[PDB]
Design an enzyme around this catalytic site. Sequence first.
Site, PDB file in Angstrom:
ATOM      1  CB  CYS A  77       2.738   1.043   7.586  1.00 31.38           C
ATOM      2  SG  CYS A  77       0.684   1.391   7.856  1.00 31.38           S
ATOM      3  N   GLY A  90       2.227   5.874   9.558  1.00 25.44           N
ATOM      4  CA  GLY A  90       3.676   6.065   8.963  1.00 25.44           C
ATOM      5  C   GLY A  90       4.239   4.571  10.287  1.00 25.44           C
ATOM      6  CG  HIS A 124      -0.563   0.183   2.250  1.00 26.49           C
ATOM      7  ND1 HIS A 124      -0.582  -0.833   3.618  1.00 26.49           N
ATOM      8  CD2 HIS A 124      -0.435   1.939   2.804  1.00 26.49           C
ATOM      9  CE1 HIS A 124      -0.401  -0.345   5.018  1.00 26.49           C
ATOM     10  NE2 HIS A 124       0.129   0.738   4.442  1.00 26.49           N
TER      11      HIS A 124
END
Lengths: 304, 304
Positions: A145, A143, A41
């Site tokens: 991720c 953030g 993503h």
Amino acid sequence: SGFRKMAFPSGKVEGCMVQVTCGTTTLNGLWLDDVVYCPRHVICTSEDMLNPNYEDLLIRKSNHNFLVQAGNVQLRVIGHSMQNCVLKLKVDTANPKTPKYKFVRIQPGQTFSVLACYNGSPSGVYQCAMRPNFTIKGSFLNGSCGSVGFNIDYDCVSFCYMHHMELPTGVHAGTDLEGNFYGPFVDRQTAQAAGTDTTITVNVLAWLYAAVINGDRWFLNRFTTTLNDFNLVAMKYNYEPLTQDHVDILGPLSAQTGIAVLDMCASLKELLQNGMNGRTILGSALLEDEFTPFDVVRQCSGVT
Amino acid sequence: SGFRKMAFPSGKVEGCMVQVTCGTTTLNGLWLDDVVYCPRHVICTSEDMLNPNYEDLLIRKSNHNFLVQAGNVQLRVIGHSMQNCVLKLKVDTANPKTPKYKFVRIQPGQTFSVLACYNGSPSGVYQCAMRPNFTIKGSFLNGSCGSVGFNIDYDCVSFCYMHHMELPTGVHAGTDLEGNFYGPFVDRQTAQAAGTDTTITVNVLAWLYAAVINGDRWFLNRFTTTLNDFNLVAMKYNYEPLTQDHVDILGPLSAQTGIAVLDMCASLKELLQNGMNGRTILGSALLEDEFTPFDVVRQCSGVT
Ligand SMILES: CC(=O)N1CC[C@@H](C(=O)Nc2cncc3ccccc23)c2cc(Cl)ccc21
Ligand SMILES: CC(=O)N1CC[C@@H](C(=O)Nc2cncc3ccccc23)c2cc(Cl)ccc21
């Protein structure tokens, strides 16, 4: 003595954390050998997340659109490939800090340490468990991720988790290092129900043995039970059914304390039906299920 | 979202952990620049611990009696000096992995991360607090001596604690990095009472703000209080008196949530007099005092 929610030393994992940018989206990547793994993503915008077509989105992206920054130096990307929900970016430099490592898919009930990262930088380390409903109760902000969960056996780092999303319910969801989500979760901005979460019975029993080892013995009683009777109680209290394999894994702790697994089950049964009456166990006013029997042995013996 | 007892990434501290042996005693040392710091009780035998004379004991020891092993390679000791309860061994090689560092003496109520070590090897990392009675509720076994507590500001590691002993009560005691014990404790095998421990009120209030930030709001009520009234309640429940400086430090969290500090105090007052009625706050059935207001801001904002 003392019992803490201890995490593995995060050093070998900090040495692999990089910042991955694509378009306006930035997250964390895991750099091992000449490969950087990150949630796929990173190629999406906020609008794309509502209903993303990752194959179509990735076709609009070239190697030069993936910015990998290790520390404060840029890594040259020479290949990009999607594997399930992770992007593998081939860089031209092997990470000199690459530890010995494995990619393992943990089972629900197992624990691991998470190194939370923002912009490729480690901010903290904590210990958590893969809940029976395949979610993690982590602490993650926007953030985070690309942050990874892992275990360490002497010098080998087994990476088991990569953080992808937070469900509307505040719980977290992610993949193994091959990009397969734990649970029914998809990397899409849509309503996703995490099923019923249950209490990891073997872990609560292990932590009850840790309490005995560290002096907390008030909960010990003059009773015993059968696996069948205990499981009827467990079902009512939303606990996982205890199996003979769980009893076998509790073997070392049962041997260390001299308290049979079924006797310990009777103590848990009474704590379930009677509560704690205001008392605590290991500084906790509730039953802890985020220490596996291996974790309790490791902490009470001193495995480095 | 999510709130965990997070520790600082332990990488910069792992790079300083060494094994220090003297006679039959082995513990952990902290190697920064060309100096190795370790508890001075490394020069004692088990018998010596009952009533040790460290000046006399150190006179029987030469540089060659101190074996410092960094990883699996020996460091040459060229100087030894006792500073309060720590030995400083001058080695001939500066640690190439020496991070930016400070030696700071934390105050009671403050938190820090501990890297537990055995034989110079890191085994785990956890977050804890310097209790008001100057003890730490750590998780330490035989061989953990020399393990350090620290905080990290971007690239600088402030070392605040070095572990020396476990009290008969299962709690832990140690020094700052200059060898001064926190509290009335001495490095002797004798009965040592840790005074009355109280609950760090400002930390519980901070963690109540963290609960509001992460959605847990059941405990919020239609009441307010005065610092004087709240402190009468705090005294009864063995809580530290809240001062105007504690209110000032809670300022950012009060501003983030829009709930005045005194309103939050009224919510804590009712939780103290009424308990939790079986409910939990941030997955906890008791009031947590091991998160400072700085820790809550850092975790809920994402400081790397
Ligand atoms: C849920 C949502 O709107 N997003 C967009 C960002 C992203 C996401 O969840 N990120 C976050 C992770 N962990 C804590 C987070 C706290 C705050 C914000 C975002 C966090 C994401 C990733 C997937 Cl795979 C699916 C959906 C979404
Ligand atoms: C109390 C005692 O007999 N000893 C000898 C070892 C040592 C000590 O406490 N070490 C330990 C520390 N942390 C957890 C420990 C779990 C188990 C065993 C030992 C641990 C020590 C150090 C001083 Cl300064 C004073 C006394 C003692």
